[PDB]
Amino acid sequence: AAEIAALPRQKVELVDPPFVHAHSQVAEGGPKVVEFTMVIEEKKIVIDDAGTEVHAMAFNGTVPGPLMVVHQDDYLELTLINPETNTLMHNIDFHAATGALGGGGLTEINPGEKTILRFKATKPGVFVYHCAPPGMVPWHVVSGMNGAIMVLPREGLHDGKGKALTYDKIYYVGEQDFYVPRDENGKYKKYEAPGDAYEDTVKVMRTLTPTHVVFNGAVGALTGDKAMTAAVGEKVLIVHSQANRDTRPHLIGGHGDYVWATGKFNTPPDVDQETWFIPGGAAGAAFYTFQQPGIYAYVNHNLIEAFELGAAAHFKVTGEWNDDLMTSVLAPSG
Amino acid sequence: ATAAEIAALPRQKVELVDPPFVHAHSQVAEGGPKVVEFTMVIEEKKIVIDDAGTEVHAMAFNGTVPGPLMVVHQDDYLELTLINPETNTLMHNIDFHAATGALGGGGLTEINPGEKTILRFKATKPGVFVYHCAPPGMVPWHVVSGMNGAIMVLPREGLHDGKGKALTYDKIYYVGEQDFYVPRDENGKYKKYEAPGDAYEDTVKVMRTLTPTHVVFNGAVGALTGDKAMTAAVGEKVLIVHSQANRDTRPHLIGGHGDYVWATGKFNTPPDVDQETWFIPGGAAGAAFYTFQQPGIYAYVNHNLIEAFELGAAAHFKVTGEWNDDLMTSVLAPSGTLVPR
Amino acid sequence: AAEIAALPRQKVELVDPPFVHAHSQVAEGGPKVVEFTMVIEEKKIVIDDAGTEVHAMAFNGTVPGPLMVVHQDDYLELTLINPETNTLMHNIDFHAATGALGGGGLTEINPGEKTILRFKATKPGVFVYHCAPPGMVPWHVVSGMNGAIMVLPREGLHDGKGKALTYDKIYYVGEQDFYVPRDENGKYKKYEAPGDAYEDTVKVMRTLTPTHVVFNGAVGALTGDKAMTAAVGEKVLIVHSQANRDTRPHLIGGHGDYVWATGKFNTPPDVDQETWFIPGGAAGAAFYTFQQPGIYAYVNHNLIEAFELGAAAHFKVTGEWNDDLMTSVLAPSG
Ligand SMILES: O=N[O-]
Ligand SMILES: O=N[O-]
Ligand SMILES: O=N[O-]
Ligand SMILES: [Cu+2]
Ligand SMILES: [Cu+2]
Ligand SMILES: [Cu+2]
Ligand SMILES: [Cu+2]
Ligand SMILES: [Cu+2]
Ligand SMILES: [Cu+2]
């Protein structure tokens, strides 16, 4: 702790998921204080094609909050702002951090306040962060107040046996379970302010059964034309977080070649995975090299959650077909 | 390979057998890459899933739930002829999690009743993998009506432990675990329908609760119990492959262990050892290797014991041989006095 | 045979969770027959602050039953007693044991009976044990009749790269799902005898949705004055079991530095974990060295189960704050 005042500072401009801000895989030079700013927004979001609304409580105005990237032993310095236009106290708990409830006990900010938190990123991996105000923990989390950080090793990613792993592209999929109340007639209810939905929401939460499970804040957010892109031969890192509930991601037509299912880079990755499992409260990352072009779906493989409740994204991959890997010998025919 | 080199390879036609058994195969591959041929007919049919006579309209690969296990080796080609008979009412296809491209084959295999297709893929990654039907717009409904199975892609050189020692099994069984979602009437009695389509709306409503009414092995409560128990002998090394295409499960052999478990099902990831209960996420298959050391009845269960013993996910193994008192012995059998209660 | 008959015998007095009876990490001497005695108590317990009560079926009178510690290749010899004051037959199944349904087939005792089972502890790890009477297995387990045992390697714990891990303190957290029926008004029912609750309880169980998920038998049992304690610099092993349902433990403000999430010490541990996953029917263990003082919460990180249904514990850790790891650069302010 002597001295951090002396270390280089670097200010980062955050971008909206599923993209990730600029960063280098291998650390250029020594330890830094890496600086981020996020503003909290409470706002209504519409989550499906029926006009269903949630009162979201959103870091940077998005669900999930943006991905922050630092290197191991960097200091992450966060300016967190709760504008006066908000109604609730908020804070932040980084699972990457050591002490004071992951920073939660040091960052309680009422509307009109700000705070600056610094922590040392001592363990490499992807980690969830989320709001956790005393007495209202799960309600902020399942109103979308969560995201993830990645803490890369200084030397960048490696497989289990020291071989370097370099990605071309990285995408951040935040999965969210939402619990939207229904009236006597089975229609989703609307409210005029976040606090008004509280009691009705807690009733649904206690059933443990979400009404929607979505990627990047809405059904179809990452589909069709809002689809993640790649090319045949590109190496893609997919970071996936779920702050509350388990998930089992699967790339339909592909694999996880290397999967840190626990999200922790000092634990050697599983290989050749069809479906991996990320427990509620954790983030995980999978590395894949695309081999075939076309549309891939990326899903939570409880297929009711994926296809009925919203948990499905697309990858659109360009390139030439490889008939050795797969071919239609006889097309469907009568 | 080019198409020219592929047409040159030896071809092997396999006759599939119903689960929990597995067709004849070799552990270590004899020779180089082959084209292994399988045929499956899809059958939509009513199945009875409990002793109360509860029905579902199953959508079954080869007429069973789960569909049969197909066994190939790494870098073989699997060539499937898939037939959807004109007596079925729905379109079907197949998605192999083992395959690369076109939604695991689903985008190339859409067949209406009266059609057939032939797909070929290269099995480039060793492990056990789920396959399932996946028709656009109707994906979970086909899967939770039983339209799923698994394949095993063995390493050329057979299985090894984490330290490259060979692990040779004497018997293999395949347990496919299925969550069903059977609608209930006013009186809480299970509904019956004429055709699969008639059950659709009411089934989706149950599915959205995420709560199955039955969780069964081999298509029915008690299917692998009593005289249908799996069998082994003391000293025998058994591989149990287990799949769940939709929902998590946590298998456990009551009275035994998983000595080597590929809980993710993938043989390049080293197995976990000495497991009491292992976890297979929905959408995957896993495999456990065990050597029986004690005779008697064992139960093999999903260890959410409500799913095992109330909803149906329990099977038996009956194991022959001599008892080992060093491993366990009753020092004092239940005894005492007969008291009022 | 003679060999087995001549082994030394050690009687161990059990202690209630979350504490653990005295033992040595490294075995002192060669194999022994370790003797334990447990009496089964069926009794009414209060599980929340609303006075909800359940008829518990408790090994040694506690939920969970106590942790038994032996080392690999010791024999565990258990005397299990079903007092004449009880109403139901009970038995025991050790997942650590080989044969006769884990011992369940050899230990079926009516009230007024006792039995003694010996088994060889051949595999190292933490393992669940639970009651399992034929045809009523889940009902005894979710009435609290489960615990865990720990079979230490002879050489004590290691990180698998061979380095010794020596803990200063060990705590045992047993997590229990309860399924308490409600009447027409939504108020939890009370019953005269445990048999009276059976039909109503099985109906709740079939929903797969617990009414309460608690640590150490009640909401708040390990919070406030009953928090687990440690100091900065101490190494703590937390053994956690769940006999029926999955859990995802997380130390808020900390990590699992080494986690045997499967509970088996010949499988090398995961490292740097944020949240780990223990499937229903298993026990796991996490090893952590505290670095910061203060309150920590230890939770199931489905936060609805943690903060709404009861699955949250506290650690109170003494020592000096380390500003290098974390610091409030600017405290909450306008
Ligand atoms: O392979 N996706 O269900
Ligand atoms: O060990 N069977 O629950
Ligand atoms: O990090 N606590 O949820
Ligand atoms: Cu908040
Ligand atoms: Cu958290
Ligand atoms: Cu189908
Ligand atoms: Cu799939
Ligand atoms: Cu009992
Ligand atoms: Cu058990």
Q: Which of A55, A71, A130, A255 is catalytic?
A: A130
According to DSSP, the residues that pair with A174 across neighbouring strands are A241
Name the residue facing C329 among A93, A116, A267 (closest C-beta): A116
| H helical segments located in C192-249 | 198-205
Pairing of strands B171-180, B237-244: parallel
B91 among annotated binding-site residues: no
User: Ligand 6: distance of its center to the CA of B111 in Å?
Assistant: 9
User: Ligand 3: distance of its center to the CA of A95 in Å?
Assistant: 7
Q: Is C95 in the pocket of ligand 2 (CB under 6 A)?
A: yes
Is A332 close to B116, i.e. CB distance below 8 A? yes
CA distance B91 to A334: 13
CATH 2.60.40.420 holds for B156-322:
yes
CA distance C80 to C38: 5
DSSP string, A254-275: --EEEEETT-BTTSPPEEEESB
Of A16, A55, A60, residue with least CA distance to A39: A60
Question: Which amino acid belongs to residue A91?
Answer: N
- In ligand 2, which atom is closest to the CA atom of C93? 1
- Both tokens assigned to C36: 């334990």
Query: What count of residues does chain B have?
Result: 341
Q: Is the peptide bond before A64 cis (omega within 30 degrees of 0)?
A: yes
CA distance A166 to A117: 31
Task: Write phi, then psi, for B105 (nearest 5 degrees).
Answer: 115, -15
Name the residue facing A308 among B6, B208, B285 (closest C-beta): B208
According to DSSP, the residues that pair with B253 across neighbouring strands are B300
Cβ-based neighbours of C108, under 8 Å, separated by 6 or more: B334, C89, C91, C133, C134
> Closest-lying ligand to the alpha carbon of C254?
3
CA distance A247 to A310: 13
Separation of first and last alpha carbons in chain A: 75
CA distance A171 to A238: 5
CA distance A32 to A34: 6
Q: Helix, strand, coil proportions of chain A in percent (round to 5)?
A: 10, 40, 50
B215 and A CB contact within 8 Å: no
Contact A330, A233 (CB under 8 A): no
- Rg, Å, chain B Cα set: 21
Q: Is B81 exposed, middle or buried (0-12, 13-18, 19+ CB in 10 A)?
A: middle
CA distance A287 to A164: 12
Measure the CA angle with vertex B31, ends B26 and B32; round to 5°.
115
* DSSP single-letter state for residue C224: G
Q: What is the residue with the minimal CA distance to atom 1 of ligand 3?
A: C252
Contact C88, C243 (CB under 8 A): no
User: Ligand 7: distance of its center to the CA of A198 in Å?
Assistant: 36
CA distance C117 to C132: 15
Measure the CA angle with vertex C43, ends C41 and C46; round to 5°.
135
CA distance C183 to C203: 12
CA distance B101 to B124: 12
| H helical segments located in C147-193 | none
Q: Is B95 in the pocket of ligand 1 (CB under 6 A)?
A: yes
Quick one: CA torsion of C12, C16, C17, C20, rounded to 10 degrees? -30
CA distance B58 to B41: 14
Contact A305, A213 (CB under 8 A): yes
Contact B291, B246 (CB under 8 A): no
* DSSP single-letter state for residue B310: I
Residue with tokens 């040392």: A120
Quick one: CA torsion of B250, B255, B259, B260, rounded to 10 degrees? -20
Cβ-based neighbours of B198, under 8 Å, separated by 6 or more: none
SS3 A106: coil
In C291-320, which positions are buried (b, 16+ CB within 10 angstroms) versus exposed (e)? bbbbebbbbbbbbbbbbbbbbbbbbebeee
Q: Is C166 exposed, middle or buried (0-12, 13-18, 19+ CB in 10 A)?
A: exposed
Q: Is the peptide bond before C64 cis (omega within 30 degrees of 0)?
A: yes
CA distance C267 to C259: 10
Residue of chain C whose alpha carbon sits nearest to that of A91: C332
User: Ligand 4: distance of its center to the CA of A91 in Å?
Assistant: 6
- Both tokens assigned to A334: 């009568």
Maximum C-alpha span of chain B: 83
Of C7, C286, C285, residue with least CA distance to C127: C285
CA distances from B306 to A158, A192, B203, B301, C177 (A): 42, 41, 22, 10, 11
CATH tag for B8-155 (out of 1.10.10.10, 2.60.40.420, 1.10.760.10, 3.30.1540.20) = 2.60.40.420
According to DSSP, the residues that pair with C43 across neighbouring strands are C56
List all residues of chain C from 273 to 312 with a beta carbon under 8 Å from chain A.
273-277, 291-292, 294-297, 301-309
B269 and C CB contact within 8 Å: no
According to DSSP, the residues that pair with B37 across neighbouring strands are B13, B79
Note if A228 is an active site residue: no
Is C302 close to A244, i.e. CB distance below 8 A? yes
SS3 B237: strand
Q: Is A161 exposed, middle or buried (0-12, 13-18, 19+ CB in 10 A)?
A: exposed
Question: How far does Cα C192 stand from its chain's mean position?
Answer: 28
- Both tokens assigned to B249: 């499960």
Helix count and strand count (H, E) for chain B? 4, 22
CA distance A218 to B111: 32
Separation of first and last alpha carbons in chain C: 78
* DSSP single-letter state for residue C94: E
CA distance B156 to B241: 18
Alpha-carbon distance A194 to nearest alpha carbon in chain C (angstroms): 18
Note if A35 is an active site residue: no
CA distance A229 to A220: 15
CA distance C128 to C41: 19
According to DSSP, the residues that pair with C9 across neighbouring strands are C33
Question: How far does Cα A3 stand from its chain's mean position?
Answer: 33
Q: Is A252 in the pocket of ligand 1 (CB under 6 A)?
A: yes
Contact C160, C269 (CB under 8 A): yes
This structure's resolution (Å) is: 1.6
Maximum C-alpha span of chain C: 79
If one counts every other C-beta atom within 10 angstroms of the C-beta of residue C3, the result is: 8
Cβ-based neighbours of B88, under 8 Å, separated by 6 or more: B42, B43, B44, B113
Pairing of strands A326-333, B171-180: unpaired
Separation of first and last alpha carbons in chain B: 76
Pairing of strands C68-71, C146-152: parallel
Pairing of strands A93-94, A75-82: unpaired
- Both tokens assigned to A321: 């077909």
Task: Write phi, then psi, for C198 (nearest 5 degrees).
Answer: -55, -60
Cβ-based neighbours of B252, under 8 Å, separated by 6 or more: B276, B277, B278, B300, B301, B302, B303, C95, C281
CA distances from A11 to A32, A36, A126, A314, B49 (A): 10, 6, 20, 32, 62
**A223, containing H or E segment:** none
Residue of chain C whose alpha carbon sits nearest to that of A268: C270
DSSP string, C270-321: EEEESB--B-TTEEEEEEEE--S-EEEEEEESSHHHHHTSS-EEEEEEES--
- Rg, Å, chain C Cα set: 20
Residue of chain C whose alpha carbon sits nearest to that of B326: C120
CA distance C30 to C33: 10
* DSSP single-letter state for residue C195: G
Q: Write down the CATH number for the domain with range C6-153.
A: 2.60.40.420
Q: Considering Cα of A137, then A138, then A143, then A146, what sign does the dihedral take? A: positive
In C89-123, which positions are buried (b, 16+ CB within 10 angstroms) versus exposed (e)? bbbbbbbbbbbbbbbbbbbbbbbbbbbbbbbbbbb
- Rg, Å, chain A Cα set: 20
Q: Write down the CATH number for the domain with range C154-320.
A: 2.60.40.420
According to DSSP, the residues that pair with B99 across neighbouring strands are none
- Both tokens assigned to B200: 């659709």
**B3, containing H or E segment:** helix B3-8
* DSSP single-letter state for residue A108: -
C130 among annotated binding-site residues: yes
Question: How far does Cα B330 stand from its chain's mean position?
Answer: 36
Quick one: CA torsion of A180, A184, A187, A190, rounded to 10 degrees? -60
If one counts every other C-beta atom within 10 angstroms of the C-beta of residue C32, the result is: 18
List all residues of chain A from 131 to 160 with a beta carbon under 8 Å from chain C.
132, 137-138, 141-142
Q: Is B262 exposed, middle or buried (0-12, 13-18, 19+ CB in 10 A)?
A: buried
> Closest-lying ligand to the alpha carbon of B106?
1
Measure the CA angle with vertex C282, ends C196 and C86; round to 5°.
30
C39 and B CB contact within 8 Å: no
CATH 2.60.40.420 in chain B: give the residue spans: 8-155, 156-322
Name the residue facing B339 among C112, C128, C282 (closest C-beta): C112
What technique solved it?
A: X-ray
Cβ-based neighbours of A114, under 8 Å, separated by 6 or more: A79, A80, A81, A82, C330, C332, C333
Of A253, A238, A232, residue with least CA distance to A167: A238
Contact A278, A182 (CB under 8 A): no
CATH 2.60.40.420 in chain C: give the residue spans: 6-153, 154-320
CA distance B132 to B61: 9
CA distance B329 to C311: 38
According to DSSP, the residues that pair with B230 across neighbouring strands are B317
SS3 A204: helix
Residue with tokens 């979001």: A45
DSSP string, B159-170: EE-TTS-EE--S
Mutate to test the interface with A, among B264, B267, B278 (most CBs of A within 10 A): B264
Contact A175, A247 (CB under 8 A): yes
According to DSSP, the residues that pair with C179 across neighbouring strands are none
SS3 A247: strand
Q: Which of B54, B57, B73, B97 is catalytic?
A: B97
Pairing of strands A312-318, A228-231: parallel
Pairing of strands C312-318, C294-300: antiparallel
CA distance A59 to C285: 34
CA distance A277 to C275: 12
CA distance A136 to B217: 41
CA distance B99 to B116: 19
